[PDB]
């Protein structure tokens, strides 16, 4: 007769008529709509973590190691390199993905009777894993620059007394870090935590938020990923730094064996050539300057970024744009910003092409007063 | 420094302790029940030049929807049982513990509940409590099988929203009966979950031949954990009606699977039949083991899986001591009167059994 729905299923009803995360499929020439390293990884790499996974491999029949000591203890060594921060393994908790360190940070901080707050336009998976968890999302406005407004953040804070605090930094979509005094008044008023994401630290010109953790222990967690600079969305690991007692608290909350020895043994691979892969970083910033540059040369507004991606506009139509842009083979991301849309910085050849279509599609800029 | 107290941690948290049990130094592991044969060369081989293929591309993200894993799932699956699954019929994740926590994501959660017939599976009451599922118990029977009336009575009076069944069961061994089965389904107003984490070891067909009968309500789980000898690679499954994997997607954490653990679970896939080959000497020694635990004085319940829940001790946490001692390290499930011994190697279970023999001496008469 009839196959069964999901109308049919017993779902929660928070849950229905909601449609799946994601974009769907598309394999076209120019993909810049994830925020992803365009450098694929170096064979010596490819090596490493191949020998890495080899060596676990033979013991695939036993549970991994449950806390991923060794794997933490090599993110607290790259990141003390990093950030002259002196940081241990206690201070170290890692997941599959940010997702899932973001995920675990609400179930012990966040989820149902708490709430959660975002300055928005910021990241579509701040909200989303707040919802997902049953954590109560609160939003307040950043500036028309599309900065940190901080009075307006500061008052929202102390007025609503969110549980937990989100704050990207640098901010994805408009790749704008927040400056360290905004980020100090903030934290003076936040009642709960403040989680400090910083996806793309590694691209910034300013120090990691990391230096704080030190000054706000009972509150700041900074969260940094392996899916951006290090090339590595496709092994899908997260971590966290934050004062010991944190990392208990995700003990609590935590799937025990989340992390399997194969990610653990490829993930210690990839941190073996920190420095082979974040030499990248120089040049990412180069051609996303150069880019940046050529759309403000030709009369595209552009929010200055300190990440590895930019925000541009002002489209009269940014929907219709995005279709464009589409129509000459570049895929770049409306994060729902209206008027302006995200291109990601690629290889050059990628960039040259993004430049070449944004010429054309120039003329669909709003006219000037 | 701060500690955990002064954080502001969930009310609901308090008091709390992490699970797992410490990873202690032992010569025999017999504690949880992971297959005992490490993988094979060809295995080894095929997991490692599947993983460079993967690792070629780590810049990029991985399928958000692991479709050519999933239809591996269903191919093996359906040559397994003889019951036609499809890519539509299963999603996938990070163990069954994953599973698990997206099932109740979906289906429980706040304001609903789940109950489980105990004693069973220690990860069923966590994972419900971890997505804020209310946790309801109903006890088996005596012998540690199903009590239908009373499982059947309890799901009628509370209404639980999800229904928990292991199949065969952790920690007695004992696969419920199709007609216990129906039974509960019969009466669960939400989803029932046959855990069947040991089908690999069961004498008796697959519960995914009931997914067909009863689609709207009915999930099951498996895991490439046990058998299969993939536990490191922390990779479980469901088996549903296609509706079901639709719900998944609202509830999973995208890109959950990575490229790496896509291309690993593939690879050990294509050498189930070898990996499986062990099925029935694991089984073999397992009867062997009971036999001769019998022979020695001890009740042990009848298992349908790669374990053996027996006793009866006059102190079991002490006898699990005893054990230890002797450097054999089973598993205290909690069970006044008994422990959990996992199928090992020959050698590991004459081990077991070889201690076994004076600490029979603390059995109750
Ligand atoms: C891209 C991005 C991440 C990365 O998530 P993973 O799960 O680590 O891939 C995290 N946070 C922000 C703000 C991002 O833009
Ligand atoms: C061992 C076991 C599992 C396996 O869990 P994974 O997360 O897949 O390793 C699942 N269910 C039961 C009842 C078990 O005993």
Not at 48 to 60: G, K, M
Request: aromatic residues 6%; negative net charge; contains cysteine.
């Amino acid at each position: 007769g009839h196959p069964v729905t999901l109308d049919d299923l017993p779902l929660r009803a928070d849950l229905r008529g909601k449609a799946p995360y994601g974009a769907p499929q598309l394999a076209v020439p120019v993909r810049l709509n994830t925020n992803e390293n365009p450098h694929p990884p170096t064979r010596a790499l490819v090596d490493d973590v191949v020998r890495s996974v080899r060596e676990a491999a033979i013991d695939l029949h036993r549970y991994p190691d449950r806390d991923a000591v060794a794997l933490r203890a090599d993110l607290a060594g790259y990141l003390t390199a990093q950030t002259g921060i002196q940081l241990g393994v206690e201070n170290i908790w890692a997941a599959n993905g940010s997702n899932e360190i973001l995920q675990q940070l609400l179930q012990a901080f966040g989820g149902p009777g708490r709430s959660a707050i975002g300055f928005v336009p910021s990241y579509s998976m701040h909200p989303i894993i707040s919802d997902g968890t049953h954590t109560e999302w609160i939003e307040a406005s950043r500036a028309n620059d599309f900065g940190l407004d901080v009075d307006v953040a500061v008052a929202a804070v102390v007025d609503r007394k969110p549980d937990v605090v989100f704050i990207a930094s640098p901010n994805n979509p408009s790749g704008q870090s927040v400056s360290l005094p905004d980020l100090c008044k903030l934290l003076d008023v936040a009642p709960g935590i403040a989680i400090v994401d910083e996806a793309y630290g590694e691209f910034s010109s300013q120090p990691s938020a990391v230096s704080l953790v030190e000054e706000y222990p009972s509150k700041l967690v900074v969260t940094r990923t392996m899916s951006k600079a290090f090339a590595f969305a496709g092994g899908r690991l997260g971590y966290l730094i934050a004062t010991p007692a944190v990392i208990d608290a995700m003990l609590l909350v935590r799937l025990p064996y989340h992390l399997s020895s194969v990610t653990q043994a490829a993930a210690r691979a990839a941190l073996r050539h920190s420095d082979d892969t974040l030499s990248s970083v120089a040049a990412l910033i180069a051609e996303r300057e150069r880019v940046t540059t050529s759309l403000n040369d030709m009369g595209f507004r552009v929010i200055p970024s300190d990440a590895n991606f930019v925000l541009f506009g002002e489209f009269a139509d940014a929907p219709a744009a995005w279709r464009r842009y589409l129509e000459a083979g570049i895929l770049i991301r409306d994060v729902g910003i209206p008027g302006y849309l995200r291109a990601t910085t690629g290889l050059a050849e990628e960039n040259d092409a993004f430049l070449r279509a944004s010429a054309r599609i120039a003329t669909d800029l709003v006219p000037v007063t």
